[PDB]
Design a protein around this ligand. Sequence first.
Ligand SMILES: Nc1ncnc2c1ncn2[C@@H]1O[C@H](COP(=O)(O)O)[C@@H](OP(=O)(O)O)[C@H]1O
Ligand SMILES: [Mn+2]
Ligand SMILES: [Mn+2]
Length: 224
Amino acid sequence: GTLVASVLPATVFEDLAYAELYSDPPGLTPLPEEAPLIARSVAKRRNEFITVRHCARIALDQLGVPPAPILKGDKGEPCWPDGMVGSLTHCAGYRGAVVGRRDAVRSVGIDAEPHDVLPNGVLDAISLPAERADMPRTMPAALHWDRILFCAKEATYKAWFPLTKRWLGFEDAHITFETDSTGWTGRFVSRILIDGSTLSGPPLTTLRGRWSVERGLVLTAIVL
Ligand SMILES: Nc1ncnc2c1ncn2[C@@H]1O[C@H](COP(=O)(O)O)[C@@H](OP(=O)(O)O)[C@H]1O
Ligand SMILES: [Mn+2]
Ligand SMILES: [Mn+2]
């Protein structure tokens, strides 16, 4: 499908690709070098791991990148082929991978969750008092803004960490939202409250991403 295309820019076709599934189609296996990572993993984990890397390899193949194992590195972050970047996400009913060429794309962060209210207490634990106040006013009451905030915080971390290799807690970023007049999609900009020093290039002070609610899921993505 093309749900995640709703939260990506349209201009980078040569240096950005994506792939998604809504299930774990029987038959997929990990590459030989990936199997030790799930040898002792629960069934749910084996499946999401295998399926999402299948998607990652379809996206890479669209960009002329031969298949390759995708291991986990610093703090669980995925290890991409030479010259490539990307992000992965899996939740109930969704698996998604977005990859890009490092020259044109500097980093990717994506996240997917079911469009449902947050469980008890997690909201206060992932949001600043100013966000809880400003956010609900910016979008319709049909949306679970708490969950959308959540996904945007996680997308911000995924885009941020490969570039700094430093922790970004939920209180270290202020995110602001804006909805387009369809009522189900929009934008957000994440303003960094701590040192944005990166290992290469200019520091990160703002991350502009997109969000939408498609087919009962929330999707967010940042493309630097
Ligand atoms: N520090 C980190 N930085 C960037 N990406 C990370 C990360 N830790 C995990 N990821 C990725 O987050 C993915 C899961 O996202 P989500 O929680 O939304 O389902 C992980 O999938 P994998 O463990 O299968 O590689 C991993 O690829
Ligand atoms: Mn997951
Ligand atoms: Mn997530």
